[PDB]
Protein backbone atom coordinates (compact mmCIF):
# COMPACT_ATOMS: atom_id res chain seq x y z
CA UNK A 1 0.00 0.00 0.00
CA UNK A 2 1.05 3.64 -0.46
CA UNK A 3 2.15 5.79 2.45
CA UNK A 4 -0.98 7.93 2.14
CA UNK A 5 -3.14 4.80 2.00
CA UNK A 6 -1.55 3.56 5.23
CA UNK A 7 -2.21 6.91 6.89
CA UNK A 8 -5.86 6.99 5.78
CA UNK A 9 -6.29 3.46 7.15
CA UNK A 10 -4.47 4.14 10.48
CA UNK A 11 -2.29 1.16 9.56
CA UNK A 12 0.44 1.61 12.14
CA UNK A 13 2.42 -1.46 11.10
CA UNK A 14 2.77 -0.05 7.60
CA UNK A 15 3.41 3.49 8.84
CA UNK A 16 6.18 2.19 11.13
CA UNK A 17 7.68 0.11 8.31
CA UNK A 18 7.67 2.99 5.81
CA UNK A 19 8.53 6.02 7.93
CA UNK A 20 12.11 5.36 9.02
CA UNK A 21 13.60 8.87 9.01
CA UNK A 22 12.57 12.48 9.23
CA UNK A 23 12.52 13.01 5.46
CA UNK A 24 9.75 10.42 5.13
CA UNK A 25 8.12 11.72 8.32
CA UNK A 26 7.74 15.08 6.54
CA UNK A 27 5.63 13.38 3.85
CA UNK A 28 3.69 11.40 6.43
CA UNK A 29 2.91 14.48 8.53
CA UNK A 30 1.70 16.40 5.45
CA UNK A 31 -0.60 13.53 4.47
CA UNK A 32 -1.83 13.27 8.07
CA UNK A 33 -2.73 16.95 8.14
CA UNK A 34 -4.28 16.81 4.67
CA UNK A 35 -6.45 13.81 5.60
CA UNK A 36 -7.29 15.19 9.09
CA UNK A 37 -5.64 12.23 10.87
CA UNK A 38 -4.61 14.03 14.05
CA UNK A 39 -3.93 10.70 15.81
CA UNK A 40 -1.34 9.76 13.18
CA UNK A 41 0.14 13.26 13.21
CA UNK A 42 0.69 13.15 16.98
CA UNK A 43 2.06 9.62 16.66
CA UNK A 44 4.66 10.87 14.18
CA UNK A 45 5.55 13.79 16.45
CA UNK A 46 6.14 11.33 19.29
CA UNK A 47 8.48 9.18 17.14
CA UNK A 48 10.50 11.95 15.46
CA UNK A 49 11.77 15.24 16.85
CA UNK A 50 10.32 17.90 14.57
CA UNK A 51 12.10 21.27 14.53
CA UNK A 52 11.79 24.62 12.79
CA UNK A 53 14.22 23.27 10.20
CA UNK A 54 11.82 20.39 9.47
CA UNK A 55 8.99 22.87 8.86
CA UNK A 56 11.22 24.72 6.40
CA UNK A 57 11.93 21.43 4.62
CA UNK A 58 8.22 20.56 4.44
CA UNK A 59 7.61 23.81 2.58
CA UNK A 60 9.88 22.50 -0.22
CA UNK A 61 8.74 18.87 -0.43
CA UNK A 62 8.61 17.05 -3.75
CA UNK A 63 5.47 15.23 -4.93
CA UNK A 64 3.28 16.04 -1.92
CA UNK A 65 0.14 17.75 -3.16
CA UNK A 66 -0.69 19.19 0.25
CA UNK A 67 2.57 21.03 0.72
CA UNK A 68 2.63 21.96 -2.97
CA UNK A 69 -0.72 23.74 -2.64
CA UNK A 70 -0.59 25.03 0.95
CA UNK A 71 1.68 26.61 3.52
CA UNK A 72 2.32 24.41 6.54
CA UNK A 73 0.62 27.08 8.68
CA UNK A 74 -2.45 26.94 6.43
CA UNK A 75 -2.56 23.13 6.77
CA UNK A 76 -2.33 23.47 10.57
CA UNK A 77 -5.21 25.95 10.82
CA UNK A 78 -7.69 25.42 7.99
CA UNK A 79 -9.52 22.45 9.54
CA UNK A 80 -10.33 22.35 13.24
CA UNK A 81 -9.77 18.59 13.18
CA UNK A 82 -6.03 19.33 13.26
CA UNK A 83 -6.20 21.57 16.34
CA UNK A 84 -4.01 19.35 18.54
CA UNK A 85 -1.30 19.42 15.86
CA UNK A 86 -1.57 23.22 15.66
CA UNK A 87 -1.28 23.26 19.46
CA UNK A 88 1.89 21.18 19.31
CA UNK A 89 3.50 23.35 16.64
CA UNK A 90 2.77 26.62 18.45
CA UNK A 91 3.71 25.31 21.91
CA UNK A 92 6.99 23.88 20.57
CA UNK A 93 7.87 27.07 18.66
CA UNK A 94 7.93 25.34 15.30
CA UNK A 95 5.99 28.03 13.40
CA UNK A 96 5.57 31.78 13.65
CA UNK A 97 1.98 32.34 14.78
CA UNK A 98 1.83 35.34 12.40
CA UNK A 99 3.51 33.85 9.35
CA UNK A 100 1.92 35.32 6.24
CA UNK A 101 0.78 32.65 3.80
CA UNK A 102 2.66 32.51 0.47
CA UNK A 103 1.11 29.57 -1.42
CA UNK A 104 -2.60 30.11 -0.80
CA UNK A 105 -4.67 33.11 0.33
CA UNK A 106 -1.44 35.06 0.19
CA UNK A 107 -1.00 37.45 3.08
CA UNK A 108 -3.49 35.73 5.40
CA UNK A 109 -2.43 34.27 8.76
CA UNK A 110 -3.61 31.35 10.89
CA UNK A 111 -5.90 33.75 12.77
CA UNK A 112 -7.63 34.57 9.47
CA UNK A 113 -8.45 30.88 9.06
CA UNK A 114 -9.62 30.54 12.66
CA UNK A 115 -11.84 33.63 12.43
CA UNK A 116 -13.39 32.52 9.12
CA UNK A 117 -14.24 29.10 10.51
CA UNK A 118 -15.61 30.64 13.75
CA UNK A 119 -13.64 28.03 15.68
CA UNK A 120 -13.84 29.51 19.17
CA UNK A 121 -11.20 27.29 20.78
CA UNK A 122 -8.71 27.87 17.96
CA UNK A 123 -9.39 31.62 17.92
CA UNK A 124 -8.78 31.87 21.65
CA UNK A 125 -5.65 29.71 21.51
CA UNK A 126 -4.14 31.78 18.71
CA UNK A 127 -5.00 35.13 20.35
CA UNK A 128 -3.47 33.89 23.61
CA UNK A 129 -0.24 33.26 21.65
CA UNK A 130 -0.06 36.72 20.06
CA UNK A 131 -1.86 36.02 16.79
CA UNK A 132 -2.88 38.89 14.53
CA UNK A 133 -4.78 39.01 11.25
CA UNK A 134 -2.96 39.31 7.96
CA UNK A 135 -2.34 42.81 6.63
CA UNK A 136 -2.79 44.11 3.09
**Entry resolution in angstroms?**
1.5
Q: Per the domain annotation, does 65 fall within a domain?
A: yes
Method: X-ray
Alpha-carbon gap, residue 90 to 126, rounded angstroms: 9
Q: Per the domain annotation, does 71 fall within a domain?
A: yes
Q: Per the domain annotation, does 133 fall within a domain?
A: no
Alpha-carbon gap, residue 113 to 22, rounded angstroms: 28
Contact 55, 95 (CB under 8 A): yes
Structural domain for 80, as ranges: 3-128
Q: Per the domain annotation, does 96 fall within a domain?
A: yes
Return all residues near 2 (Cβ < 8 A) that are at least 6 apart. Answer: none
* Main-chain phi, psi angles of 3, to 5 degrees: -60, -45
- DSSP reduced 3-state for 23: helix
Q: Per the domain annotation, does 134 fall within a domain?
A: no
Alpha-carbon gap, residue 134 to 123, rounded angstroms: 14
Q: Per the domain annotation, does 42 fall within a domain?
A: yes
Q: Cβ atoms within 10 A of the Cβ of 92, count?
A: 13
DSSP letters spanning 77-104: HSSGGGHHHHHHHHHTT-S-TTPPPSSS
* Closest residue by Cα to residue 28 from 10, 52, 3: 3
Tally of domains within the chain: 1
Amino acid sequence: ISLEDAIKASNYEEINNKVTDKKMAHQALAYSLGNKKADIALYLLSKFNFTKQDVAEMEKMKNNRYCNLYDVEYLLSKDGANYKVLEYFINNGLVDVNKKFQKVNSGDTMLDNAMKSKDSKMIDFLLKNGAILGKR
